[PDB]
Ligand binder design. Sequence first.
Ligand SMILES: *C/C=C1/C(=C/C2=NC(=C\c3[nH]c(/C=C4\NC(=O)C(C=C)=C4C)c(C)c3CCC(=O)O)/C(CCC(=O)O)=C2C)NC(=O)[C@H]1C
Ligand SMILES: *C/C=C1/C(=C/C2=NC(=C\c3[nH]c(/C=C4\NC(=O)C(C=C)=C4C)c(C)c3CCC(=O)O)/C(CCC(=O)O)=C2C)NC(=O)[C@H]1C
Lengths: 482, 482
Amino acid sequence: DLSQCDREPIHLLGGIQSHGVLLAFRGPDRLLEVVSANAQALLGRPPETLLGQPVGRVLPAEVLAQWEPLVARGSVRVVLPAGAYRALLHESDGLTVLELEPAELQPGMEETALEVVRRLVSPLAGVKGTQALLQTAADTVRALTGFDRVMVYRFDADWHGEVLAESKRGGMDGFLGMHFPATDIPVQARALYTRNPLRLIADARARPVPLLPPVVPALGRPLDLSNSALRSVSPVHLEYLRNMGVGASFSLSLLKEGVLWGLIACHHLEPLHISHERRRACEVLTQLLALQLSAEERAAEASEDAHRAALLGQLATAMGEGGTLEEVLEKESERVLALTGAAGVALLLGEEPLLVGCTPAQDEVEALVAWLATQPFQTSFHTDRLGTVYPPLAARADVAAGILAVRLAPAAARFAIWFRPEVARTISWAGNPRKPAEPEPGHQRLHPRGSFQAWEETVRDTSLPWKRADLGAAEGFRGALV
Amino acid sequence: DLSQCDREPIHLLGGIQSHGVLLAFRGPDRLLEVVSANAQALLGRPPETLLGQPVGRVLPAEVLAQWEPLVARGSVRVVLPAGAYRALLHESDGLTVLELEPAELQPGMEETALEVVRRLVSPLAGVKGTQALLQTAADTVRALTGFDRVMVYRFDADWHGEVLAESKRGGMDGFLGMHFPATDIPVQARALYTRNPLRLIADARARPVPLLPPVVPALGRPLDLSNSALRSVSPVHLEYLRNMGVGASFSLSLLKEGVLWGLIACHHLEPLHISHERRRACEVLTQLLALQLSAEERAAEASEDAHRAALLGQLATAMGEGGTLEEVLEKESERVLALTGAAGVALLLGEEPLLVGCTPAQDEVEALVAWLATQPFQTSFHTDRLGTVYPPLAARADVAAGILAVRLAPAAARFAIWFRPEVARTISWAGNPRKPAEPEPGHQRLHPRGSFQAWEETVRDTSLPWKRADLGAAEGFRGALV
Ligand SMILES: *C/C=C1/C(=C/C2=NC(=C\c3[nH]c(/C=C4\NC(=O)C(C=C)=C4C)c(C)c3CCC(=O)O)/C(CCC(=O)O)=C2C)NC(=O)[C@H]1C
Ligand SMILES: *C/C=C1/C(=C/C2=NC(=C\c3[nH]c(/C=C4\NC(=O)C(C=C)=C4C)c(C)c3CCC(=O)O)/C(CCC(=O)O)=C2C)NC(=O)[C@H]1C
């Protein structure tokens, strides 16, 4: 439900962070059209007086000197009186945007970064778990940035999240294991972080620096800061950080195969600036983890299919040895249930239902048997909470919280149905998820919740979720019984 | 093993390359036990005068100054009158081995390597092929190293190889597409390159520097140089390099899930030395490429399986519909042959064989059947050159160069046999593959071939290979035939 939270235009807030300067230029004279109000502390003159002036009248030589590789490459290091700065160039709203922030100061940064890239490639990671892969990614991002807490955050299908892994200094509270509402990161934020994979919040208590003028005159709204490294973030999120007791924040999008899988989120208790070059070095790490997860995930999935296929094949064999449907199905009980990781299975071969392992009563199966016919599924149907869809069996969570059903005939209702019991799960939410925000009276002013202490909830009446291999295995069993 | 080529103990040749110095110390007094004969060029005095001295009294002060971190990290930079050097430690034959080698002179090396690691780890790699991956891998190694010609070299199953990709500077001889005898890299070299994944030959024309004494006194043979970065290589190979017109060579092992998959092989026309840290940066790229390849390959196999499972799912639906068996093995003719990418199929389900598509005559199929029933196979059998093993069909490469057979019953002869035609292939070898070496009369001194000019051969009478997904699909078909 697109509430207040999803409707704040976080690319049109018109402010930048105080540690950098932003200038925007228009046209072939490159006339200054927008400038951050703090620009005097790097240009020498009041920002108000530079609007409408050509880039050659406005920038210092050291910068202009490096315009071509800047335009070609996006960023260059320039040494100005105030010190070493990184200059970043992009295009937005038909303007050339130039940002300046302090440059990396450690000469051996790239050398350290190459070493941790090795830890994260290595012969084989994931060796004792994809778990171990996440922990190393957290550990190495924490090594390269120096943040007090680094966490790997995975989105669930409903866009709520949980901290799978976490590397942090001794003496820091943690969030390992906890789940967070989907509204902690609303729709338009997720969309932006799909496009802009990096964001640094250098000081969560600093006031944002405004742009001048406050609109782009051509457009009647603020400059689009979607791709600004200096963009100041939603004030609601600043409040969220300060309620966590967080003084600086850095997060990196984990894009797996083009989709937003999760984040690596970093917290620091005191303000902290990370250089652009160091941020891009961390981003190489996150692209690395994303690749290691894909290769391991696909290996896991091929090994699972292998196991299922061996079962179908041993089944196949058994049938070729004595015309004995019920006979062999009863003899190969483990295999038929193992096919899909099930605890029971009804085989509707026409006459009576044949019930193997742990199932609902004969009456009750016929009841969902009849109900299954009038359903809009083609050849297979599956659910991990039968009760939420067919309450005649809502009380049988003990044997049928989940079913996987394949249709063995066109017209007619001949099926094999696998059953799963519920599996109770205790999840710990970081604060009470029924009160994920605090709106003011009148529900125009929204605020973050004030507490992130564990709030425990137990999930009932849902099975283990049917995996792609379960489905494939069911399709193959259907091919063999036709 | 076979040739004299496999016999040469290449880790026991007792020589190092002239750009570095090797020292080996024994026991608690760190007494110098083995030293390269050029050691004076770095330590002022006659090496022979140094055997038996404690490390503290042989090594220059500058190296000693760094002793603690060297043994710790195993590598360190030291500034000596002669220039900056990388000091490397490892253990061999119970000695501590110290190697000295000119250090990297460009301070921006690591920044550069991080840039090329981006190009290769980036989102959307291979997104115009694994071919594009290899091309990118060669291009990035060539840029990082400066070598004239960089090639990606893949081992076939018989351990001969072919250049799959190549990045070289304008107007340079190439080898793209050519095949090289397995003996070009004999067995003990392949073994050594699986555990020591980097090798540099700085000057293909230089004489090796001997070690003193020529044996380890305790062992009566020379110091094991398996792990030496300075190891001078087999003389037959140096002769092979010079016959190629190559003055410097550097290659890296490509390990993919533990096995030796290929090499990245670089040639320079003149001598050239890459620093150790620059070679370790290149090693990061090859580990990257191997990761990229596993993920792309396991994705390709998943997509293949899904296409086959879709075919089986459509066959399953044509069954349980109208008619007999031969009455759906008839429109699904197309599907039945597509299961395994085949041009024909014979079905022995009881009566006479049922022949679908491009098959050999019924009498020939009957005789093949009779023959297959006596071979030693459980469920499936396959070959891509039927003729070598069953010469009654050696003449029929037009329809039956390859076969794939599943048993549809136990002690019975019920089969499904899929057929492929031959696919002619034009291999171009780098020189005459019938003369891969030139021995001297008496067969005690071998030399490499003199020529690498293209040498054509056409492989006849072999089908396209039966891949994993064909085999899985066949097993799937057998499960539906019961
Ligand atoms: C009413 C709307 C709400 C809201 C808005 C909001 N949050 C934003 C950014 C953001 N949230 C998170 C959440 C987390 N940070 C953590 O460490 C954890 C758990 C470990 C979670 C769940 C993150 C990581 C970010 C990114 C910024 C950062 O610190 O890394 C934004 C976008 C901010 C922007 O302008 O870019 C918005 C609009 N948060 C709420 O809780 C409610 C009230
Ligand atoms: C009778 C033995 C023979 C022999 C021995 C041999 N070769 C060795 C190393 C080596 N060979 C190759 C081959 C290639 N180089 C290329 O560029 C291509 C293709 C374009 C090929 C096929 C390589 C790459 C290497 C590794 C060293 C390198 O140059 O990168 C060795 C081991 C050398 C060592 O001591 O490490 C041996 C013993 N080669 C023959 O041709 C026959 C005569």
